[PDB]
Design a protein around this ligand. Structure first.
Ligand SMILES: CCOc1ccc(Cl)c2c1[B@-]1(O[C@@H]3[C@H](O1)[C@@H](COP(=O)([O-])[O-])O[C@H]3n1cnc3c(N)ncnc31)O[C@@H]2CN
Ligand SMILES: CC(C)C[C@H](N)C(=O)NS(=O)(=O)OC[C@H]1O[C@@H](n2cnc3c(N)ncnc32)[C@H](O)[C@@H]1O
Length: 1003
């Protein structure tokens, strides 16, 4: 427990040191003077402030945190800014939900929630009332996020932090300029479009204000109106003299020529309501709600209902249907009808729909269903399927044939009906050929929309838009599809889309899966409704009654990052003094044009030229954005809008378009979904309190470098804490006994081995950092680094070398610094370094000798084998025999393997061909049993450690390697003497079975 607290103590000390030193603050006026190795601009999509930051946010931003930590050692100057996204409706929604209980009840409120979740966050009874207003959220949560992040030690220039609502004047002016330019370039358009709409909120319901179906969009249905004829059914007697229609939903209008009846569910609650011209429609409450928000009613969102009934109350009614050859068709029941899809009313196409002929045959079979629901013989019997569409492999009556073949006799055969449905599922879309007059011999794909238009023009059909999948909003409202007027960004313009496609070609995606995601969302995207009326954000500068949603004021704010330090100077809300003395309102459209457009003319403003030139310098220096890391959930929405807006804002400058975007999966905690409802959920401040910042960052580095879901394990973090504490204690011990270390020329065998292993680790870890594979970087630059050091300490019989251990400590610290900068800074000052580790450079690797490394692996294997043989037959004297060359039979088989390897670019044939060729060689008579195990071992070690096992002699001196460590071998084996001999001296068994690299031994 005290180790975590020691880590936290060191962390707080070093954090205060960094703050006073002002190390991570960068200025373009000064950095542009000393040309170094370039700039590195990383961004994290600023998070929503409707709560505290948790572990997923920190895992996602850890990518660019470690990236800055590494890239600064390679000489570049880094810009890691951090904003806070307050725009949106959840903040205001929760504030108003809190005010609801504040005003309708008391403090505390009497029940029979929001106050409970606020108190669960540890707020005082008297301090939750202040949260009835959103401004208190804006004053409360952003400072806590900043505090936690600073406590994590992010290499962030906090002077460039800001807030995103109109409360911030500077960001407000920035978004004003952005959308003014967008509308000036014909990117924003006012129009009436279809959109997922929240009735309780009164505005479109986009991706980040939903709770179910993150990307689900509307779906189109052909809505047939079947007129009800007199004599009306009983329940509709009160609606005499008016026009009554059954509104059936369908997805295949071209089939309506073969209608025989109409299916309703007898146990469903159907609603008859009045439309815009006074007619009466019969559907369900949800269908009517959607139609009312699609202009089907006199008032938007008002459904004047004039009758409620059950499906049984409609059975037997007489209908007149379009297109069909039957002049009067009847309403009949069907048991299997979904209440989530359509209008609850289905048309009957018995020729090409399996469910229809199934239900019709069930009604034609027994009088039980006809008398249970009141169906006489005129409503079912004189109705036969009508040939309309012919599939070549089935005929004019496809459903009839495939349901006679699958031997179905009921409408409740879910499996058989699903199979018959999928068999002819799409074979009607393309290969169908019409048969009715006016369309004989036509491709169904070539006539379906024409017949739909035919029915819509004659007033016999309409267009009904319903959510494809069920959608739920943040405010617990079930959304509809509304055809409403709004301002939208025109992401469907072919020119804009092709330019963004080129930008995607130029963009760096660390895997092809993300490129495919981008291609799909680029081919699928169209108009994007961007206007809200309820919530926080920035108003349209010309339509002050509309606000701008959260997914649209966040497209090019990275440009605002480059000047936020000179505009508002660290004060989040932008309410403090300006460092350059620029008033919040003084930033006009032309001023922003001059700042962000290189070829823009200097306008007439009271601002001095030096200030605006400094701003333009900052922008043109820091741009473009090199890297942007995020979760794979922001690819279908935010990142595509980001590419689009960068293309539209700087259309002549592809060099200002984003460079790279790295996406990761979502974080699991202890291999389980992280959620507050299940128990496992860590916020950033909780995680720091529990594991220290460096321990948390270490366990975060090992989480996951793929796009598959990442795994944060607590036990791994605890083990990392233990290892960090032991490492710091080891460093302290070594600094204490500086004079107890061997010095001079480091010439011993293990000195050279360890030098080469250290350099190879430097090279491998540099590589793994370049690929942002931080798990592999931690593997090669810490765990395996420490394993090499432990082997070096264990094998150094004459004690470790002074300069070599100093170099190992220096380099291990320089490698670990991007993961654990606090511990590394502390150990840096422990070594007596003059400057901070934040000024260091990436360590230079020396020469790497593969022969030494392979020999050390050999010695490891030999020692493991010796200790395993020590298990059985009190020992005191051992003798090892080492073969200088392979014995004759082994040499012959290995020469055959070498020949075959040389034949075809290093592929060894099947052991069958090998055994044949070796059984054809006369010398190999006494050895055919021993042959194939040799080939098996050779293939295993070829797959394991390269083709070097095909060498006829080891690349290094085997006996000399053993002699360099005879002392250690004798000590660790608890023996008195070890005799290393050249195999030729041994007896017959050993001399015959010994081979180089596999030396034998006997006690
Ligand atoms: C896929 C089989 O659909 C076919 C297949 C062949 C033919 Cl010829 C047709 C249809 B289809 O009937 C409607 C509509 O198109 C189709 C809509 O599919 P989805 O399950 O609601 O997603 O199901 C039917 N449907 C619509 N609402 C329904 C509901 N609430 N319950 C059950 N079925 C419904 O139109 C014609 C005449 N029936
Ligand atoms: C620019 C604007 C339109 C974006 C908007 N402000 C926003 O999205 N704010 S946010 O707090 O929900 O997320 C911000 C970043 O943190 C990642 N992330 C979030 N949760 C998890 C998780 N459970 N697991 C893994 N990563 C996660 C997420 O992808 C994103 O890059």
């Amino acid at each position: 427990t005290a180790k975590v607290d020691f880590l936290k103590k060191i962390e707080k000390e070093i954090q205060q040191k960094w703050d006073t030193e002002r190390v991570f603050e960068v200025n373009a006026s000064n950095l542009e003077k000393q040309t170094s190795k370039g700039k590195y601009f990383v961004t994290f999509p600023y998070p929503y402030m409707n709560g505290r930051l948790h572990l997923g946010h920190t895992f996602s931003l850890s990518k660019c945190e470690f990236a800055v930590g590494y890239q600064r050692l390679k000489g570049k100057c880094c810009l890691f800014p951090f904003g806070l996204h307050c725009t949106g409706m959840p903040i205001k929604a929760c504030a108003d939900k809190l005010k609801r209980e504040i005003e309708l009840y008391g403090c505390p409120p009497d029940f029979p929630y929001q106050w409970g979740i606020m108190k669960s966050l540890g707020l005082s009874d008297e301090e939750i009332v202040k949260f009835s207003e959103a401004e208190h959220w804006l004053d409360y949560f952003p400072p806590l996020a900043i505090q936690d992040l600073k406590r994590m030690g992010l290499k962030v220039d906090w002077r460039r932090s800001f807030i995103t609502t109109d409360v911030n004047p500077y960001y407000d002016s920035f978004v004003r300029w952005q959308f003014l330019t967008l509308r000036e370039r014909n990117k924003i358009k006012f129009g009436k479009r279809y959109t997922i709409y929240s009735p309780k909120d009164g505005q479109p319901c986009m991706d980040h204000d939903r709770q179910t179906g993150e990307g689900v969009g509307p779906q189109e249905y052909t809505l047939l109106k079947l007129k009800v004829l007199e004599p009306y059914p009983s329940k509709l007697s009160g609606l005499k003299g008016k026009n009554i229609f059954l509104v059936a939903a369908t997805l295949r209008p071209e089939t309506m020529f073969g209608q025989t009846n109409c299916w309703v569910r007898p146990d469903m609650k159907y609603i008859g309501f009045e439309t815009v011209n006074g007619d009466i429609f019969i559907c369900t409450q949800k269908a009517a709600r959607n139609m009312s928000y699609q202009g089907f009613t006199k008032d938007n969102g008002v459904v004047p209902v004039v009758k409620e009934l059950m499906g049984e109350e409609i059975l037997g009614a007489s209908l007149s249907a379009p297109l069909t050859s039957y002049k009067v068709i009847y309403v009949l029941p069907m048991l299997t009808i979904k209440e989530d899809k359509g209008t609850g009313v289905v048309t009957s196409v018995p020729s090409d729909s399996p469910d229809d002929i199934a239900a019709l045959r069930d009604l034609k079979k027994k009088q039980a269903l006809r008398a249970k629901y009141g169906i006489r013989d005129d409503m079912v019997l004189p109705f036969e399927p009508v040939p309309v569409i012919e599939i070549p492999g089935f005929g004019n009556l496809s459903a009839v044939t495939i349901c006679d073949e699958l031997k179905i006799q009921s409408q409740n055969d879910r499996e058989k009906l699903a199979e018959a449905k999928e068999k002819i599922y799409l074979k009607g879309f393309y290969e169908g050929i019409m048969l009715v007059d006016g369309f004989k011999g036509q491709k169904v794909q070539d006539v379906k929309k024409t017949i739909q238009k035919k029915m819509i023009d004659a007033g016999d059909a309409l267009i009904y838009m319903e959510p494809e999948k069920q959608v739920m909003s943040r405010s617990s409202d079930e959304c509809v599809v509304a055809l409403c007027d709004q301002w939208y960004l025109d992401y469907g313009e072919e020119n804009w889309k092709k330019q963004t496609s080129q930008c995607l070609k130029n963009l760096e995606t660390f895997c092809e899966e993300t490129r495919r995601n981008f291609e799909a969302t680029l081919g699928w995207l169209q108009e994007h409704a961007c206007s809200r009326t309820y919530g926080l954000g920035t108003h349209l500068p010309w339509d002050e009654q509309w606000l701008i949603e959260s997914l649209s004021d966040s497209t090019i704010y990275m440009a605002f990052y480059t000047v936020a330090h000179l505009l508002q100077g660290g004060n989040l809300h932008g309410q403090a003094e300006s460092p350059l003395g620029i008033r919040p309102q003084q930033m006009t459209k032309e001023v922003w044009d001059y700042v962000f457009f290189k070829e823009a003319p200097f306008p007439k403003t009271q601002i001095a030229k030096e200030k605006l030139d400094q701003l333009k310098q900052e922008f043109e220096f820091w741009y473009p954005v090199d890297l942007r890391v995020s979760g794979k959930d922001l690819v279908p929405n935010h990142l595509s809008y980001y590419l689009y807006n960068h293309v539209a804002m700087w259309p002549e400058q592809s060099d200002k378009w984003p460079t790279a975007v790295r996406a990761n999966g979502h974080l699991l905690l202890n291999s389980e979904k992280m959620s507050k409802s299940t128990g496992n959920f860590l916020t950033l401040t909780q995680a720091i309190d529990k594991f220290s910042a460096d321990g948390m960052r270490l366990a975060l580095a090992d989480a996951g470098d793929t796009v598959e879901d990442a795994n944060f394990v607590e036990a791994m973090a605890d083990a990392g804490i233990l290892r960090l504490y032991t490492w710091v204690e080891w460093v302290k011990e070594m600094v204490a006994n500086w004079d107890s270390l061997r010095s001079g020329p480091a010439s011993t065998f293990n000195d050279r081995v360890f030098a080469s292993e250290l350099n190879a680790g430097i090279i491998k870890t540099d590589q793994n950092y370049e690929k942002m594979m931080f798990k592999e970087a931690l593997k090669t630059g810490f765990f395996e680094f420490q394993a090499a050091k432990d082997k070096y300490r264990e094998l150094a019989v004459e004690g470790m070398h002074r300069e070599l251990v100093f170099r190992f400590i220096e380099v291990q610290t320089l490698l670990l610094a991007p993961f654990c900068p606090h511990l590394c800074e502390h150990i840096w000052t422990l070594l007596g370094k003059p400057d901070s580790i934040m000024n260091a450079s990436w360590p230079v690797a020396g020469p790497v000798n593969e022969v030494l490394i392979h020999s050390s692996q050999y010695l490891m294997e030999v020692t493991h084998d010796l200790r395993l043989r020590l298990k059985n037959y009190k020992p005191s004297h051992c003798t090892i025999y080492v073969a200088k060359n392979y014995p004759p039979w082994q040499h012959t088989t290995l020469s055959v393997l070498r020949k075959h390897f040389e034949a075809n670019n290093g592929k060894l044939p099947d052991n069958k061909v090998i055994a044949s060729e070796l059984g054809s060689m006369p010398e190999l008579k006494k050895y055919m049993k021993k042959v194939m195990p040799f080939v098996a071992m050779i293939k295993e070690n070829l797959e394991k450690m390269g083709p070097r096992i095909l060498d006829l002699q080891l690349e290094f001196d085997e006996k000399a390697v053993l002699m360099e460590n005879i002392v250690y071998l004798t000590n660790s084996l608890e023996l008195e003497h070890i005799e290393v001999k050249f195999a030729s001296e041994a007896e017959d068994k050993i001399r015959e079975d010994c081979c180089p690299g596999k030396p034998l031994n006997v006690f």
